[PDB]
Amino acid sequence: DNSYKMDYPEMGLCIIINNKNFHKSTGMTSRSGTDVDAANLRETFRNLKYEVRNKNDLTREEIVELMRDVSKEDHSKRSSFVCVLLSHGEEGIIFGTNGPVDLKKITNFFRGDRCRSLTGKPKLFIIQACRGTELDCGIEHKIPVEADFLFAYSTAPGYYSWRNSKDGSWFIQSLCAMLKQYADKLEFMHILTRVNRKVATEFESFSFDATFHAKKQIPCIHSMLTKELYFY
């Protein structure tokens, strides 16, 4: 088939992990605006008919435990799985409230051989988090166990990701907006491509700090999908 079967009884789970406040032992900044993102995503994926579960302020231990338990559920009647991670990060890494956890450690639970009721089904990981500390100044028989994953990163590898304290993150703002406008029209990659354009063209940082001012962002789609994905 050219497209994933999406007419199982249920679209699937949408797990949203929303980390706003981090232990003093960590130092990390409180992520103002992230509640706007989490509420936007809840509504957006509700309209896509996902069973949304919001989780706030999870330690790295609780993140791993949550992902383990969800991967052990029976997803036989579900078309897909969505996980949204909202937090600080570094390349290859997401922060629990008390420290960093490896993305690979989270995603491994859902491998084709480790979560058999999601085998052959699309596993979507949506990640609003930094992937380093660079700034963009801008210009002008069997299947693989790693198949059928998609990682929609807010930013390019190595770079900061931007979040507005009032409006929410650039990426999630744009993601929800493009899903609301195009989920009944476009395949998911083409939706995420429009998200790339929106983030790349309509946003630019404003800062009193010259070092952080007038910066740009391009999201990064990492696709190991084997079929086209439509939400209708």
């Binding site: 929303n18 989490a38 509420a39 809840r42 949304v52 579960r53 919001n54 989780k55 706030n56």
Partner: peptide
Amino acid sequence: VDDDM
């Protein structure tokens, strides 16, 4: 099971 929001 389960939901914070």
